[PDB]
């Protein structure tokens, strides 16, 4: 019964290669060489944002473009001024191991998560003048790796136990559960409509799943390593993602193929963060040879280069109006380059 | 600070200053630990005797006004190198193991060696620990179940002259626990060029000193480190 | 969340009391204190302000060296001690709650106050056109108020609050920074203007408006207050 079940697994996987085989005319970079190259952007470091005690793990940006979160595994998170650097608030945590930061589209919750398998919510506007935990959330097995926000009372979790879980705050459980990845999932991005969204486990393989019905609608492949990092573009029609093999690729939704693929044997060490820019020209991806380098998203040629951190960088964020870029790093210093 | 809001501001800046400065002074005198190991080792009676799906059991220890923070492994996956590489900053890493089983002694050793390889856990010494002593000497004095049965070198095997035994102690049994020490230290020594230092012990928890190990072997580590910074070792 | 004070009464000139405005129900350590003055038949005046901290200090211009402000974190108390009152000190005293970062609303909350009676420049200054008119129950209403000096300030905020103070409670917050609603206020004020002169509109008139509103600019120390229009149906 195994060997002929399995028979039609290999036949229709087949199938589906050879259909994704004879579905392709042309690369991006040939039909795109008839493009006026990018020049350099000569990019510098406006401010640098220090205070913190052991290394950053994770920022994220506001949606006012002004304010961003931070968080440490030294059991702090803090909240920046992006322009006269102050700090709004310092808020102390549980469990001294937090990889996860996220901050709510409205700009009232804030969550954060880690060893612990618990996403905490904090609740920052509130009649009293300090941010206290509004409701714990536990039912995952291993350890939470990513989460953001869909709406003010939708969560998305995923977790450590190859299962990423949609949540709902105001009851308090799992209203949805998602399976289909054998290594734990370590990386999760949203689309632009919030009505999709991908992530990429260990097994060096990405899934896009749906929303509303709550299952999973295409499989991406052509990795070797696992993945540290994905990112939606901004049209929501592709997605770029970061591996450690020094590859990091750019897919597509609607022709489900592999376009481009950005690569130098210059460098050896690993991609540990993408963002794209409010244009799409641009692709930034950071490295562990202490190096943010910054890729052509049309032509795979490099545009420049912002070295200037002590030791890796671990994550990077584009600024929502598309003015700044933040690069936070291992050497405990947020540096907001422009 | 050009309007009385900006002032306002940077005061309760300076206020958040002072608070991480202060955490930042509790926090630099602390010294971490880890606690890897295995099931059938007894990490709980230890854990407890220092004194719900939670993958941190976080516990805390003084001895001689020193601070230890023992960061036990909880109710995560089998898979371990995604957690790991968090830990670069500890001091040492308790390996607790259990001998008296005979079996379960090759997936210890298979254990240690990952831990005593991997890239970013290195620089970091090991305080390795043996447990379950007097059910290790009960199983020689009953007999039946033989070290020749799993490994058959234990015949041709002698004990070593620097083997101090304790009163009693049937030299059968100090044969064996020096075999599986030897067998422990002779991975530890396989690699690690003079960077981090393999630390056995033989405890049986049961209310025995276990602290003023840790601390020594942390005295130990932390002077070799100091030493070999000013180029005078 | 509640405000509560002690003392009042009738004093004879040249002595001194102490009365104090206890808080509990937040937290006191994280919130800047103001004080208020406002006569029975007059409008509301600046007293003093404290930071959190305590490190910033500002006094009226009136009053400078003679009054005297202290707190008390532990026990979350505030105390005001009067030396050499005189006759014309004789008006409503308010604690009044703020907290200052970016994005906050200070001048939120409002305690119930005290009853204390005595026995017989190139500041902005700032006016009202109006003191009474008028309106009806359904219609709109439009009040202005107007400055000597242009509010804008470089980052591009202008700092005006209107408070509208019922006739027998203490008053509210409706809009601060001139464009940005109150907490619970109903989703019928605004305000509007050039950076000289602003203007306030309410769209529809319900039972609950009936009061006397308040002007008011935040941009240096005096901290100077408006005059106030009655509003009778």
């Known amino acids: 019964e195994l060997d002929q079940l399995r028979q039609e697994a290999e036949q229709l996987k087949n199938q589906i290669r050879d259909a994704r085989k004879a579905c392709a005319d042309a690369t991006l970079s040939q039909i795109t060489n008839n493009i006026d190259p990018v020049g350099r952007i000569q990019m510098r470091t406006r401010r640098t944002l220090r205070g913190h005690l052991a290394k950053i793990y994770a920022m994220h940006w506001g949606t006012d473009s002004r304010l961003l979160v931070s968080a440490s595994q030294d059991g702090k998170l803090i909240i920046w001024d992006s322009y006269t650097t102050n700090k709004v608030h310092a808020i102390p945590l549980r469990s001294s191991w937090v990889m996860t930061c996220a901050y709510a589209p409205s700009g009232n919750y804030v969550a954060c998560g880690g060893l612990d398998n618990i996403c905490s919510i904090y609740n920052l506007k509130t009649r009293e003048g300090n941010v206290r935990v509004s409701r714990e959330l536990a039912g995952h097995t291993g350890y939470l790796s990513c989460c953001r926000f869909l709406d003010d009372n939708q969560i998305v979790t995923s977790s450590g136990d190859t299962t990423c879980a949609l949540w709902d705050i105001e009851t308090g459980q799992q209203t949805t559960t998602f399976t289909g990845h054998t290594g734990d999932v370590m990386s999760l991005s949203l689309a632009p409509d919030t009505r999709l969204f991908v992530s990429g486990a260990c097994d060096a393989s990405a899934k896009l799943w749906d929303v509303r019905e709550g299952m999973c609608r295409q499989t991406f492949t052509g990795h070797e390593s696992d993945i540290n990092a994905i990112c939606f573009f901004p049209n929501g029609n592709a997605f770029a993602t970061g591996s450690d093999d020094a590859t990091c690729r750019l897919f597509d939704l609607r022709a489900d193929q592999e376009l481009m693929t950005y690569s130098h044997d210059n460098i050896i060490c690993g991609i540990t963060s993408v963002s794209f820019s409010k244009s799409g020209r641009l692709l930034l991806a950071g490295y562990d040879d202490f190096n943010c380098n910054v890729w052509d998203a049309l032509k795979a040629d490099r545009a420049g280069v912002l070295a200037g951190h002590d030791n890796r960088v671990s994550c990077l964020g584009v600024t929502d109006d598309g003015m700044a870029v933040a690069t936070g790093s291992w050497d405990s210093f947020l540096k907001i380059w422009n | 600070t050009l309007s009385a809001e900006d002032k306002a501001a940077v005061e309760r800046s300076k206020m958040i200053e002072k608070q991480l400065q202060k955490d930042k002074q509790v926090y630099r005198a602390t010294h971490r630990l880890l606690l890897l190991g295995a099931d059938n080792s007894g990490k709980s009676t230890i854990v407890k005797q220092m004194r719900k799906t939670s993958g941190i059991f976080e516990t805390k220890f003084q001895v001689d006004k020193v601070n230890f923070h023992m960061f036990d492994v909880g109710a995560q996956r089998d898979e371990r190198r995604k957690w790991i590489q968090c830990f670069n900053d500890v001091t040492a890493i308790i390996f607790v193991v259990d001998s008296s089983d005979y079996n379960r002694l090759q997936e210890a050793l298979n254990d240690f060696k990952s831990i005593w390889n991997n890239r970013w856990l290195r620089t970091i010494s090991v305080i390795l620990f043996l447990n379950k002593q007097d059910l290790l000497a009960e199983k020689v004095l009953a007999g039946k179940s033989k070290i020749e049965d799993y490994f058959p070198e234990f015949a041709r095997y002698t004990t070593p002259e620097d083997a101090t035994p304790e009163p009693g102690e049937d030299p059968r049994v100090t044969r064996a626990k020096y075999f599986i020490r030897d067998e422990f230290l002779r991975i530890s020594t396989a690699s690690g060029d003079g960077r981090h230092y393999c630390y056995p012990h033989f405890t049986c928890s049961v209310d025995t000193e276990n602290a003023r190990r840790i601390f020594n072997d942390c005295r130990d580590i932390i002077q070799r480190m100091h030493l070999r910074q000013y180029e005078l070792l | 969340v509640q405000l509560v004070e002690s003392g009042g009464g009738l004093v004879q000139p040249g002595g001194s009391r102490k009365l104090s405005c206890s808080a509990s129900?937040?937290?006191?350590?994280?919130?800047?204190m103001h004080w208020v003055r406002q006569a029975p038949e007059k409008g509301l005046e600046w007293v003093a302000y404290?930071?959190?901290?305590?490190?910033?200090?500002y006094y009226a211009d009136t009053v400078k060296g003679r009054f005297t402000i202290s707190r008390d974190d532990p026990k979350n108390t505030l105390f005001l001690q009067m030396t050499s009152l005189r006759s014309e000190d004789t008006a409503m005293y308010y604690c009044?709650?703020?907290?200052?970062?970016?994005?906050?609303?200070?001048?939120?909350?409002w305690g119930q106050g005290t009853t204390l009676t005595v026995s017989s420049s190139s500041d902005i200054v700032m006016t009202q056109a109006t003191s009474s008119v008028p309106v009806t129950p359904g219609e709109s209403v439009s009040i202005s108020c107007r400055s000597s000096?242009?509010?804008?300030?470089?980052?591009?905020?202008?700092?005006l609050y209107w408070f509208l103070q019922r006739p027998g409670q203490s008053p509210q917050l409706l809009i601060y920074?001139?464009?940005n609603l109150a907490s619970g206020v109903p989703d019928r004020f605004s305000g509007s203007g050039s950076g000289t002169a602003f203007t306030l509109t309410i769209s529809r008139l319900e039972a609950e408006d009936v009061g006397v509103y308040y002007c008011?600019?935040?941009?240096?120390?005096?901290?100077?207050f408006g005059a106030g229009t009655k509003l009778e149906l």
């Open positions: 008011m600019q935040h941009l240096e120390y005096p901290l100077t």
């Open positions: 129900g937040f937290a006191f350590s994280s919130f800047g």
């Open positions: 404290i930071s959190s901290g305590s490190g910033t200090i």
């Open positions: 920074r001139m464009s």
């Open positions: 000096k242009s509010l804008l300030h470089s980052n591009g905020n202008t700092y």
């Open positions: 009044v709650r703020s907290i200052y970062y970016y994005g906050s609303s200070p001048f939120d909350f």
